[PDB]
Every structure is written in C-alpha cells, then in structure tokens.
Amino acid sequence: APTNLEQVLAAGGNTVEMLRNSQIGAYVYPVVAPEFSNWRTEQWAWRNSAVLFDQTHHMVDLYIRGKDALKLLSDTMINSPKGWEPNKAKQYVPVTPYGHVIGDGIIFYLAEEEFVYVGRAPAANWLMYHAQTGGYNVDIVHDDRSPSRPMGKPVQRISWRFQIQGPKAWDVIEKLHGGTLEKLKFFNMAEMNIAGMKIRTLRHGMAGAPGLEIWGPYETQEKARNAILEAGKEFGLIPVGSRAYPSNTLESGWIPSPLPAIYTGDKLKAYREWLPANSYEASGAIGGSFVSSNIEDYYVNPYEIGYGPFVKFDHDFIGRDALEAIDPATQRKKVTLAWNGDDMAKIYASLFDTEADAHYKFFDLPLANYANTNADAVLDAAGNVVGMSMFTGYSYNEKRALSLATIDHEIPVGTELTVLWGEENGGTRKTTVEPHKQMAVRAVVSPVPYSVTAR
Amino acid sequence: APTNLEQVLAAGGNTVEMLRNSQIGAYVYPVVAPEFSNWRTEQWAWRNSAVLFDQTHHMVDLYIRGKDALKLLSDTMINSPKGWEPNKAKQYVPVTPYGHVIGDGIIFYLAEEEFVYVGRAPAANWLMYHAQTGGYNVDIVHDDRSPSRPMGKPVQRISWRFQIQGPKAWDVIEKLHGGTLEKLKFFNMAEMNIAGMKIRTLRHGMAGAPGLEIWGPYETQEKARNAILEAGKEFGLIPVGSRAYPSNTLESGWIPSPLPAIYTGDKLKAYREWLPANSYEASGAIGGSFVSSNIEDYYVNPYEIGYGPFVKFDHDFIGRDALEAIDPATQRKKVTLAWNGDDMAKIYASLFDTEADAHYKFFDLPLANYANTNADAVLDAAGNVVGMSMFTGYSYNEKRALSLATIDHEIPVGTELTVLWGEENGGTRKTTVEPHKQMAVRAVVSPVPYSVTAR
C-alpha cells in the first residue's frame, strides 16, 4: 500500500529499527566477475603493477542537459561553481537544508549545457527531485546501476566506464595512446587514443601514481577492454573483479556510504513523499554496532567525512546557512582505523570452535560490510562513543584489516581506540547477518589515505 | 598452432608441470548469484529448514537420442544396464581401458531411446567421442555449462534444473503439488505439479531427509522458481547462491573433481587427438601439495572414490578387464577429513601478520579449492604419503573445515593424519595462487557422508 518513503515511515515503526532489520540483503557490486585471477593478486597489482578497474555496473548515471543544468547543480552543491567550464569534473556533494550529507558523486562537465553524474543512488535521486519539482529547464536521462542478481538476463548501460591505475598505469596509457600523453591537473578531462577510437579521459590516480578514468558508448566496451588488456600485458596489468574492487577505497580513503540524511525534518517531507517505496532510501539497510533510536544520530555533515575543503560560500545553495553556522575546527574528522591483527585472528578463530555457544561476526574478505550503510561504534578507553566506523575490510597490500571512520577531532593519530564489531542481542534480522556475539576490536587511528602509523 | 590435446602435450613439456601451472584461473560456479542472504545462513537452511538449489548453470548437459543410445552408455559405463527402464536415473561412471575414472555424471533415462547426461565436461566429452567415432546410430545435442564470466551477456540453457532439499523439503514439495506426493526409491523419476505445470522429478535427498531434483524447459524457469519460493516461505525455504552451493558436497560426500585419466596410454591416443586444445582436459589446472612428475599418480580408479558398489561385470564395457584384475579389498577408500580447528585459526591468523615473510595459503570460505582438479598430499605420522585430498572447504553446520579424500584402506576412522596445505616453493604460477608457505594441517579420518568422529 505505501507508494513513497513518507508512507513507509508512517507505517513502519521506528525508522532506525526498520533500517537495521531491512530484508534487502547485501549491497552488491554487480555483473563484473567476482574474480579474474584472485582478489589478493588483484589488490597487489594496483599497488605494484597496473589494473583495469571495470566501473561500468555499480554506479547510477544521470545525464543532465539543458539551459538550467548548471544552475541545478549550483543550487544543490556545496562546491564552488565559479569558473567551472567544460572538461573539468567535480566531486558533487549535496547537503540538506539542515546541513547534512545526502550523498555524493562525480559530476562531469562534458560540454555547454551537458553534464553527467556518476555515483550511488542518493545524490542522483536528489538531483532528479529538484530537476522535476523545482522548475528547472533541464532534461534528465536516468541510467540505473545494473541489477544485483541478473541471473542470466542481459545487462545494458548507456556508457562503459573504466579506470587504469597503478604504478605502471601511465606506461600502459601511453602505449595505448601511441605516444606521450600529458598529465593534466586532477579531475581535468581530455582525450586519448585507444584502438583507433577517441576516448575521453579524466585525470585520476591512486597510491601516489597517476592514472585515468575513461568512458565511451556501451557498444565499444569490448573493443576498448581488449585493447587495454593486450597493451597492458607488457607491464603486468590485470583486470580487477568485483570482490577486490570496492576494497580499494579502504586504502584510498573515500567513504562511499553516508546515510542519506533525509528521514527527518519538515523541509524534507516533500522529498520523502517523492521518493518511491522501493527506493534506496526506503528499502536499504543499516548494519553495525552503533545503536540509537534517533535516526539523526546516523547523519554526517560534510566536514565530518572529509569534504570541508569543498565547501565554498560563493553561491546560493541548499543548506548554506546551516554550514555557515558550523564551526569547522570542532567537527569530527575522517581517519583510517588499523585493526589489531591479534583481534582479527580471534574473530576468525571463533568460526572453527566446535564447542563455543557463539562466534564473532563473520568478517568477509576483502570487504566485510553487510549493509549499504555501515555504522559501527568507535569507543575510547572509558567506553564513550567517540566516533562512527563506516566502511570495513582488509588490504592484502598492508596485511591489515582497516576501516574508514569519523572521530572526535581532538583524538591524536596513533591513539588506540576500539571498534565494536558485530550487533547486539545475537544480531539484527538482516539477511546478511548470522547469529553472533560482539567484539571490542582494538584499532589505531591512522591518516587518510591510509599510512602505517606507530601506536 | 596445437588444435588438440595430443599436440598440446607434445609441445607443452611435462604434463604435470603444465597442468599445475595452467593460467585458466578458478573453477567457477557460474551465473547464479554468489549469495541471496549469506552463505552461512544458506548452509544452515539445507540442514535446518529448506533450500532451493539452482543447478541450471554449472553442469554440461548431453541430450542423447537414438537406436544405439542405450548401447553407447552400456558400452562405456561400469554400471549394470540390466533391467534399466525409463524413469530411472543412474550415476554414470566411465573408466578408461586402463581402469581409471574419466569422470561421472547423472544419466536420466527419460523415455525409449531418449537419455540426458548432466555433469562435468569430462564424461560428456567421452560420450561424444564414442558417439561420433564408434559407429553408434545416435544423435547428440551438447548444451555446455554456462560461461564463467558472462559480464552482462545473456545466458541460455535448454533446461532449468533445481533441487528442493532440507528437513522441510517434502513439506514444500507437497504444498506445491497440492497434496501427498509418493516418495519413490532413490533416483526413480516421476512428476509433480508446480503452478499448473507437470514437472518431472528425480527422487533425491540429503542429511537424512528426502528431497527432489526437478527440471523443465528453460522458458518456464521463472514460473517454477517463483512458485517454489512462494510456497516455501511458510517452511523457511531460502534460495542458495553459488558461493555456498558447491560446499554442500563436503557434507554429502561426493568427490566432483577426479582428474580425467586420459593423458597417458596408447589406447587413449585417439581420444587425445579428438579432444580440442581448449577442452577442459587441455586447458584446466591441478592445484595442491601433491607433487609427482608422473601424471598417472593423479589418477583414481572407481573403488578409490566410492564407486566400487556400482561396478557390475554383467555387460561388456571399456576397462572391464582392468577392473576385474583389481582386488577391491586393498584399494584406497574415500573418507572425510575433519581439519583441526587450531590449525585453521593459525592459517587465517597469518593473513594479519604484518611482520612475517610469508603467510599460509589462503583458505576461502566456504569452498577453498583453487583449481578444477584438487590434489593435496595426505601424510601419516612418519611423513609417508598415504592418500590424496581432493575437495576442500568449510561447513558452518559443523563449524569445521572438511575435505574429501582417498586414503590407504587400513587406516582406521579416528586416526589423525596430516594434509599438506599449500604448494611448494612459494606456489605454482596458477592465477588463483598468491605467494605462500605450506602447512601440515592435522586432520581426523571420518566417515563419508561426514559424521563427527572421536579422535
């Protein structure tokens, strides 16, 4: 009977309890093969040789064209639009009127009055809502991320999107291009040759080495992929599968999964009435040890997850007054948490204990998340909640379990905190959750992007 | 340049070294979603509620019709054909002229002059070779297993094939049928109602509870699946994904992966010349600690992997004279090995050791195989090789790592052996293999199907 999020929340009891017991299952990185060689070798390659990341299937694409396209973005993003011209991309971050992050994605300025958003569903839903109800002269084509379990059905996208990354990426790129290719400034766009095609590029990189994101019409996907794999054999390039792929951000430092902060607030009711009952926001899940009966305690603002530097008070935008009221110097800060290896061994050991009444929450490798929004409590030595751990897994490059978190600003790097791993009372009813007991895992605060930190 | 297996072996150096360093990658259970809920809950359901196993995509189907169909099977199988009539299936096991197992699969006797084989590629390749070159009046339609990495391409089969299993399976089955359904003898075939369709059935079961395998034309797959899932909600039935699925045989006791024993022998040269260079036999891989430079040391005969009881000297068949010469009472015997939980914890602990020069071979969960043929050495206390471990993984139902093995017949159940886990010299060049050191894992000999055994 409910057709939108507002009706779902009115009929669903406590919002936190609903989301933490959602039956949606795992957040899937679809279609791309889970592994091409093995996930350890694939992780190793992006730090030691080169990789092809296949990004064609796990993000929503919004193609935004028209006289008011730039205005729509400017009105909804914290980012400065000043001096923005085609062939520059930005990390689009929208906040609510209350100053809280809705989501984020990459916005490509392709040409005059022509943009494309690439990212998770929440910020795309927000753009579509405003395009439709705000009176913008703009046309939008929504190309959803691919189905999670296609089960043999054909899958189409409008565009393929790859990245070539690793210390030997630029060697592969120039071999493909047929000569030297200029390294532009980060997120500037140009073009390159691949197998006789003119392929648009986005300057990118990771682990201190320059790389590229590239895209094109879906029809040429195989032609480009096969050229890249062939040219890259000389440099050890290998394709990365969907099992290893999302663990890259544990090393790179981007938190993909802030809760869209749209469940409360009178100024967000119209948006809740617009969001379908089967939307990401209505049907998804929250997993982890952090418990509050107030869904607002799961929200973050942009300063808390590393987007402070993007905020520019040089244009009108939704939530500007709220962000202006925030003191940046006292906001929580994004960090990497390096999980204690002895504690990790104890988590896994419990799976092989035939006599214990319970084991610790299964920690999948290399990505351990079990909802699309992750919220584990971070505790200090007294047991106070001092932060939220929001993305969790393991790096074969570091031989460490790692998580990305936001913690009280005064906590120094090197401090040993605890992450509460697992859920209370045997676990919520999410279909990703087997029965388990919790563990207070020791974790050392470390920089983002991750760098090995002395305790 | 090589077009067949014989040319591949002539140009490829030592046959063992070729197979143990093959670049084929993992043996994939394709297309079906890796997980629907999570693999632990899915494993639990087949012992505690009910499951839908989706078997549509991982086996080769051979449709065999014609006057000489039964003769073709009879001439090539160790099984008795005496009194075989439509609506009975058999576990077809062919051996070479030298008495060694080629493979095995399920052969359904559907009607007069109409059969279907379902199983891995090796026994299907053997049937096709003899149908084609032996002068049999028979027509064969080969429906390959689905591609390992479809990457969004559509996937078709001629038939869908499911199983409904678990202690509540028969409740679900009778709910679907609309009333009582007779439990026939094992592997006898009949029919049932599903959503107004007449669906053919094969009497099956596991863990002491009766179940069914069912099939039909691919077009009705979704209609049947949705009816089964709907009727089964009352009994807790859940679908099982491809990650959990193949671990079922660790509990059930069937070894899927004997090496097709066709690489040597003058009487098998014609078959090697017929097998394509991209066949399973030519392109696949051998993984694990057992090392011999003679590929014949990887062969098994039917007595060694539990098919002794199928051998019937009441018909002419390939390899009969060799099997008649074998003494059944002194052959190695199939067992389950229950791996020591402390040793398992030490394997996983090494992944989180930031100072060690090496870690132990990654043991994936719930299936740890990293080739399509598995060959780990089993050692006694003196270090003698006393068997071969051939399929490896973990059961959440038992909280134990388990493997299926064949060992010297005189070794009593309860004996503590060791399985050598990992490969020598840092590991072979297979793309599934990360660098690692070996471990002698303690393992207790246990019955097949697995039953908890006092040491």
Ligand SMILES: COc1cc(C(=O)[O-])ccc1O
């Ligand atoms: C940019 O693509 C990514 C997306 C996600 C996600 O949505 O969880 C994670 C890591 C990624 O690299």
Ligand SMILES: COc1cc(C(=O)[O-])ccc1O
């Ligand atoms: C009968 O289907 C199965 C096939 C395999 C395989 O081929 O490795 C393993 C377990 C199975 O249940």
